[PDB]
Design a binder for this molecule. Structure first.
Ligand SMILES: [K+]
Ligand SMILES: [K+]
Ligand SMILES: [K+]
Length: 233
């Protein structure tokens, strides 16, 4: 006798995107500063999105080049749609966004806690795209904004601060209640926290969010991808 189930994963799918995009190829010179709206592929740089200046060609999603360009294009568009109070931490092969935790916690005067969303593009079955999103909570010494270990918190501020911060961090991850206890919806709440912070970071007030591009809309659905297996006993 076998079990059946549903798996939710931290991949949020792009359900609509422009299947053809404008590109402009220029010869690759090392002298050109890399940045948003341009991607080197071999001996060419391809401009795309807001990087399109006067002229252009087009590629569609059957082209090998399309995935290479679109992955980067998608993060560049996401980086134009960050909602306050989130801020850009890094845009490279990954997009990282941060928000300071402004909910009350003991010792928030000396220890700063910060959400960090880590966003990577996933590309599968030739034409499917999505974002894989991880969440971290950074623990910072408020007075100097540097990362601080629990060991250093104990050394600098005392054991009582180290213990209260650990409970608060665990509660902000949804591993514990505010009272420092385990609880029956913790694992569900942990995933719902990730989805809710991601929606907030992109200004999403419904399950689906549209982002404008010069090639047409990109639509993401801010629900975890779901995979269902039903066993036949
Ligand atoms: K919060
Ligand atoms: K504070
Ligand atoms: K889904």
């Amino acid at each position: 006798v076998r079990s059946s189930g549903i798996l939710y994963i931290n991949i949020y799918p792009i359900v609509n995107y422009p299947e053809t995009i404008k590109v402009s190829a220029i010869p690759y010179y090392e002298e050109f500063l890399p940045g948003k709206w341009k991607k080197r592929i071999g001996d060419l740089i391809y401009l795309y999105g807001y990087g399109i200046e006067n002229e252009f060609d087009e590629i569609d999603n059957s082209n090998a080049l399309f995935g290479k360009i679109f992955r980067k294009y998608l993060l560049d568009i996401l980086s134009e749609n960050i909602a306050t109070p989130w801020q850009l931490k890094e845009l490279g092969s990954t997009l990282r966004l941060v928000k300071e935790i402004t909910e009350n916690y003991e010792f928030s005067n000396i220890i700063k806690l910060q959400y960090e969303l880590i966003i990577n593009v996933h590309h599968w079955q030739n034409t499917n795209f999505g974002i894989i999103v991880d969440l971290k909570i950074n623990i910072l010494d408020r007075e100097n904004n540097q990362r601080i270990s629990y060991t250093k918190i104990k050394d600098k501020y005392g054991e009582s601060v180290k213990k209260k911060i650990w409970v608060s961090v665990q509660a902000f991850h949804r591993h514990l209640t505010p009272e420092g206890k385990k609880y029956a919806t913790a694992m569900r709440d942990k995933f719902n926290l990730l989805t809710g912070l991601l929606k907030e970071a992109f200004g999403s007030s419904e399950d689906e969010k549209t982002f404008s591009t010069p090639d047409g809309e990109i639509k993401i659905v801010f629900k975890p991808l779901e995979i269902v297996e039903v066993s036949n006993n």
